[PDB]
Amino acid sequence: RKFTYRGVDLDQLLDMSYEQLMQLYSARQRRRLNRGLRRKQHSLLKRLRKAKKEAPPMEKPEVVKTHLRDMIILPEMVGSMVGVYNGKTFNQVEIKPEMIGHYLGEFSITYKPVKHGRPGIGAT
Amino acid sequence: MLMPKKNRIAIYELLFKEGVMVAKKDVHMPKHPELADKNVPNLHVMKAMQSLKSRGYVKEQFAWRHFYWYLTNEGIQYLRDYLHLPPEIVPATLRR
Amino acid sequence: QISKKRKFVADGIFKAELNEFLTRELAEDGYSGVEVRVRTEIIILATRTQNVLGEKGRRIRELTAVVQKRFGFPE
Amino acid sequence: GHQQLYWSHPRKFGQGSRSCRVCSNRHGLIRKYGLNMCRQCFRQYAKDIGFIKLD
Amino acid sequence: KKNKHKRKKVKLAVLKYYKVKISRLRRECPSDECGAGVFMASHFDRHYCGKCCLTYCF
Amino acid sequence: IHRIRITLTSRNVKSLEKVCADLIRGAKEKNLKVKGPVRMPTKTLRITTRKTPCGEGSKTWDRFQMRIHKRLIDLHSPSEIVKQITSISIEPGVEVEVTI
RNA sequence: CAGCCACCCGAGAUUGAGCAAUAACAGGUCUGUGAUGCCCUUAGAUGUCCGGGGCUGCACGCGCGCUACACUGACUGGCUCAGCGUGUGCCUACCCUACGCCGGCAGGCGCGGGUAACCCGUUGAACCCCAUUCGUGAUGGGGAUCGGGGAUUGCAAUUAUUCCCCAUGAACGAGGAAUUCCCAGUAAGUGCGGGUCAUAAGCUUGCGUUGAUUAAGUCCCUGCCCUU
RNA sequence: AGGGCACCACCAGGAGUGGAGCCUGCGGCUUAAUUUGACCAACACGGGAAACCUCACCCGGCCCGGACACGGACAGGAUUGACAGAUUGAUA
Ligand SMILES: [K+]
Ligand SMILES: [K+]
Ligand SMILES: [K+]
Ligand SMILES: [K+]
Ligand SMILES: [K+]
Ligand SMILES: [K+]
Ligand SMILES: [Mg+2]
Ligand SMILES: [Mg+2]
Ligand SMILES: [Mg+2]
Ligand SMILES: [Mg+2]
Ligand SMILES: [Mg+2]
Ligand SMILES: [Mg+2]
Ligand SMILES: [Mg+2]
Ligand SMILES: [Mg+2]
Ligand SMILES: [Mg+2]
Ligand SMILES: [Mg+2]
Ligand SMILES: [Mg+2]
Ligand SMILES: [Mg+2]
Ligand SMILES: [Zn+2]
Ligand SMILES: [Zn+2]
Numbered sequence A: 001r002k003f004t005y006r007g008v009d010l011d012q013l014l015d016m017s018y019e020q021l022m023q024l025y026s027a028r029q030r031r032r033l034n035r036g037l038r039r040k041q042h043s044l045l046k047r048l049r050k051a052k053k054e055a056p057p058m059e060k061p062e063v064v065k066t067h068l069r070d071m072i073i074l075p076e077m078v079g080s081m082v083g084v085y086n087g088k089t090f091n092q093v094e095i096k097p098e099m100i101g102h103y104l105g106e107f108s109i110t111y112k113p114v115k116h117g118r119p120g121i122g123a124t
Numbered sequence B: 001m002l003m004p005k006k007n008r009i010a011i012y013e014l015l016f017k018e019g020v021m022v023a024k025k026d027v028h029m030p031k032h033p034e035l036a037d038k039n040v041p042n043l044h045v046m047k048a049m050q051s052l053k054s055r056g057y058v059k060e061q062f063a064w065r066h067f068y069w070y071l072t073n074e075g076i077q078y079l080r081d082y083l084h085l086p087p088e089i090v091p092a093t094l095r096r
Numbered sequence C: 001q002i003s004k005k006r007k008f009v010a011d012g013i014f015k016a017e018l019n020e021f022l023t024r025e026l027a028e029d030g031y032s033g034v035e036v037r038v039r040t041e042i043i044i045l046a047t048r049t050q051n052v053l054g055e056k057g058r059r060i061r062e063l064t065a066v067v068q069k070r071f072g073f074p075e
Numbered sequence D: 001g002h003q004q005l006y007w008s009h010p011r012k013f014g015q016g017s018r019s020c021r022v023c024s025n026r027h028g029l030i031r032k033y034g035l036n037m038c039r040q041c042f043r044q045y046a047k048d049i050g051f052i053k054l055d
Numbered sequence E: 001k002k003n004k005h006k007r008k009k010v011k012l013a014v015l016k017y018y019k020v021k022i023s024r025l026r027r028e029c030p031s032d033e034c035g036a037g038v039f040m041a042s043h044f045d046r047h048y049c050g051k052c053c054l055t056y057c058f
Numbered sequence F: 001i002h003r004i005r006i007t008l009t010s011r012n013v014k015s016l017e018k019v020c021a022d023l024i025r026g027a028k029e030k031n032l033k034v035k036g037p038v039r040m041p042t043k044t045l046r047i048t049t050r051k052t053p054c055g056e057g058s059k060t061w062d063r064f065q066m067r068i069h070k071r072l073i074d075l076h077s078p079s080e081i082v083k084q085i086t087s088i089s090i091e092p093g094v095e096v097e098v099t100i
Numbered sequence G: 001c002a003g004c005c006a007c008c009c010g011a012g013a014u015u016g017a018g019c020a021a022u023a024a025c026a027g028g029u030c031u032g033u034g035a036u037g038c039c040c041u042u043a044g045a046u047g048u049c050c051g052g053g054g055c056u057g058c059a060c061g062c063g064c065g066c067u068a069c070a071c072u073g074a075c076u077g078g079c080u081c082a083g084c085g086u087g088u089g090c091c092u093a094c095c096c097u098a099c100g101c102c103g104g105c106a107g108g109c110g111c112g113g114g115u116a117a118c119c120c121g122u123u124g125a126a127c128c129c130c131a132u133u134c135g136u137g138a139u140g141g142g143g144a145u146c147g148g149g150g151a152u153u154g155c156a157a158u159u160a161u162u163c164c165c166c167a168u169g170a171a172c173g174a175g176g177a178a179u180u181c182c183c184a185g186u187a188a189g190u191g192c193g194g195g196u197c198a199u200a201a202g203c204u205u206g207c208g209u210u211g212a213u214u215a216a217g218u219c220c221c222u223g224c225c226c227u228u
Numbered sequence H: 001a002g003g004g005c006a007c008c009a010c011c012a013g014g015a016g017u018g019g020a021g022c023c024u025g026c027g028g029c030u031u032a033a034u035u036u037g038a039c040c041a042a043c044a045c046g047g048g049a050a051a052c053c054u055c056a057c058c059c060g061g062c063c064c065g066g067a068c069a070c071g072g073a074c075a076g077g078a079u080u081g082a083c084a085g086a087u088u089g090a091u092a
Helices: A010-015 A018-024 A027-035 A039-054 B005-018 B033-038 B042-054 B073-083 C004-025 C049-053 C055-071 D039-049 F013-029 F079-086
Strands: A064-066 A081-085 A090-094 B020-023 B058-063 B066-071 C031-037 C041-046 E040-042 E046-049 E055-057 F003-010 F034-039 F043-050 F061-076 F095-099
Touching (some): A018 A027, A039 A064, B005 B020, B005 B042, B005 B066, B005 B073, B020 B042, B020 C055, B042 B058, B042 B066, B058 C004, B066 B073, B066 C004, B066 C055, C004 C055, C004 D039, C004 F043, C004 F061, C041 C049, C049 C055, D039 F043, D039 F061, F003 F013, F013 F034, F013 F061, F013 F079, F079 F095
Parallel strands (some): A064 A081
Antiparallel strands (some): A081 A090, B020 B066, B058 B066, C031 C041, E040 E046, F003 F095, F034 F061, F043 F061
16 A cells, blocks of 8 residues: 555655664665765755755656765655766666665666677687 | 965975975875975975976985985075075085 | 884885985995994995085085985984 | 865775885785885895895 | 856956045955955855855845 | 893894893803893794786795894893993894893 | 615604706786886876776686585584784774673674783684484585675675675586696695785685505606707 | 606596586676786786776866976966855765
8 A cells, every 4th residue: 555664654754863764774774874974965965855845736856966876765855856877877767665775876777788699709 | 386485485495494305206295294384285395396406406316205306506596596595594414 | 112023124124215215316426335223324335435425525414314304313 | 176176085995095115006015014015116125125035 | 168267357456445535345354364454245145255255145 | 230121133143142142241241140041932024925027927936034033131230230231332233122 | 886775773864945057938017116218198188186887797618716416424512632923004094802791693882911922822723533413315415596684894885895693495416528736744634824905715825733545667648858 | 760857747546627506717798888918838817805996998077286498468466266146966
C-alpha cells in the first residue's frame, strides 16, 4: 500500500530529524550522517528546496544538476529532479521514496553496458 | 609576479642581511621558514629570487629539492640602491 | 628523542645530500669529498682550495651560511 | 575564490602526500627507517648513506 | 571561448565621494581596519565596503 | 659518587672497540670501578629492492644492510672526572651518550 | 704425479650467499631523476590546480597464483613449542601496544609502557599432539555466488575499501595433449615478520617449525662448449 | 666424425602446473576514456595492492606559478580583490 521505510511512512520520515533518521538508516548511511554533511551537500539541499518551492502546483520541479554522486538520498529529497553527473553527462533522475538511503551515483551509470563484437586478429 | 611590496622588501632585506638565501622548491608552502613572522609565501620567495637571477643579481644552485642563491656584486649594488641603505652597510658574508 | 635506527639513517642521508650539493657547487674547483666530524666541523677536500675559499673567504662563508640555513643548524 | 580552491584537495595520506626527497617522484618510494627515497635514488645513494651489500 | 572580465575605468572616482564646506556623500565603513578613509559602496539595495566585504542591507 | 652510564654506538666494530678499550684504560688509570663493556645485540637494518630502474629482465634483488653496534660502560666517578675521561680523542663514526 | 674412493678421529671431511673478465645486444628504461640532444606544445596549454568519471568495464584466449576435491579428513574442546624483524616520523597528517571496563563479534571507552636486549614480549604462532562428533553420502568435504544487518579507515566507500554476524551452498570425486621446479634440514606441509599501507595481501622478500621418497649417474631429449 | 658439461637437460623419483572456483597480469572485445611500457631474456613485471591523490586517459572549469629586455598605456590611477543578485557541479 503506502510507502514505508523501516515501517515508517514518508510523512513521519519528513518530520524526523537527522538523529532520528540515523537509527532508521543502514550502518553506512548512519556513519555518514554522524560524521556530518558538508557545505556542498547543504548547498545541494538548499537548491532542491528552492526548486520545490518554485515548482508550479501539480508540476515537477526544475532539474538541479550536481556532481555529488556520493550524496545520501534523504527523505526531503524525494520528488526532486536531479541531474547526476556520470563523468560525461548529467543523467536526469527523479527521486522515488524507495530510493531513500541510496547514493545518487547508484542511479547514474558511469559506463556503457558491453555488447561484444567479433574477436580481433589473434585472440586465440 | 604580482607580489605585495612589503613582501618583496622583506625578501630583499633578508637576502641583503644574510648574503644568501635558501628555499625548498615548494610553491604550496604557506610560509618561508625564515620569513614566517612576515607572512611571506615560499612561492613569493622563489619568484623574487628567480627575477633577481634573470637580472644577474644572484647566482643560483639547485640540489635535491632546495634552491640556494648567493648575492653577486651587481646584486649588492642593486639591493643597496633599492633599499636606500647606507654604503657602509654590507652583507654578513662580506662583513665577516 | 629519536630511535637509533632513524638517527643513523638520518646522518647518512645528511651526508649524502651534503656531498651532492658540494659536488654540484664545487665541481670546477676539484672537489673530491667531504668529511663531517661532530660545534660541527665540515671538511671539504679539493685540489684547488683557493677557489673554494674565494676572495678573502667570501665563498666559504657563503657555503657555511647556506649549509646552516638549509640543514637548520644553530647559528 | 581561487585561493580557497587552489590546492584544496586533502593530502594528509596516500601516494599524493609523499614523494622522493631527492627527485620528487612518487613511485617506488621507500619509507622504512624514514628514508623517504625512491628505489632508484636509494640505489644511487646507498653507499653514501651507509648501506652495503654484505649478503 | 570564455571572455575575460575587463575592468570599467572610472575617471576621477574620488570626485564622486565628496561635495564641496565639505560633504562626504558615500558612507564610511565602521571597521577597525578600514576607518573613515575607506568609503562604502552604495548599491541599489545595500552598502558594501570593498576592503573588508562588510555589507549593510537597507 | 654518581653512577655514570656511557652508551657508545657505531657502524664500525673496530673503531667502536678501540674507543671502548681506550675509555676503559683511562678509567683504570684513574683507578675507578668500571663495569666492562656490555655488548647489546647488533641491529641489522635491511633494505631489499629490485636492481633494475625499470621493470624489465630477470627479477634480481639487492640486499643492502647496515649494522649498528652498541656498547654500555658503567662508572662510579665524579661528573668532572667522567667528562675528563670522555674528553680523550674519539674516533669518527662513534656516537657517545653520557648519562648520570 | 696431479688427484680420486673408503674409513678413524673430529662440531664440521663439499653450509649458503655476495662480488664477478674480454667482447657484445640497435635487449629494457628518456614514465626514477634539477640526467640529457633534437623535435613537439606553451595561456581556448600537452604547464598547473579543482570537480566528476576511467585505469576494475566482459561472448573469448593465455600466463603467475590461492583454495580444494576429503577419514593420512572436517568439526568442537584440551594441551604444548619458534625465528627473522618492526614500532611515536623535517616537510608528514599516519606508531607498537599491555591492563581494566562495555559489547556475542567486528569494535568502543579509560588508563599506562616503549624513540626500545628496558614496553608490547617468556613474542602462550600454525601445522603437530590428546580427546569429541561426523561415517563414504557433492556429505558436517568445498566455499564460489548472493540477500539482510552491524562496525572501522577516510573529505568521500555506489561500480560492494577492509572487517564482523545470520543466511544462501556453485563447480570440483585428483585433471587430455603438454609442461615446471627440485637432491638434505633440501622438496613439500605450516604459520609468522618486512615492503606496499589512512584503510591493506590470494603478491613479493625474509623467518622459523614439521620433515621425506629417489640419486652419487649419463649424453638418450633440450641446450651450451671443445677438437678434427 | 669424435669428446665434454648442466635437475633453468635427462635418468630414478617427489611436489606439482595444465582440468574446477576464485585472485591477479596480458591479448581481444567494449568504451567518452577503459592511459601506457615490455611479447628463454614480456604476461603478482614497471617495486604497478589506482575510491580521491597517484594519473599519464575522458568530460568540464579556475589559475599563470609567461623570468628578463624593448615599446605602449598610466598617480587626472597601470592594475588588485570582492558583498549581494544572476550564473555555475561548486561559496571558482
Ligand atoms: K632513465
Ligand atoms: K628526452
Ligand atoms: K625526462
Ligand atoms: K610507470
Ligand atoms: K621512482
Ligand atoms: K593441476
Ligand atoms: Mg630496442
Ligand atoms: Mg590495470
Ligand atoms: Mg567445511
Ligand atoms: Mg554440501
Ligand atoms: Mg605488486
Ligand atoms: Mg625445461
Ligand atoms: Mg622426468
Ligand atoms: Mg588452472
Ligand atoms: Mg640462460
Ligand atoms: Mg584499490
Ligand atoms: Mg583517479
Ligand atoms: Mg582528478
Ligand atoms: Zn628519487
Ligand atoms: Zn570595511
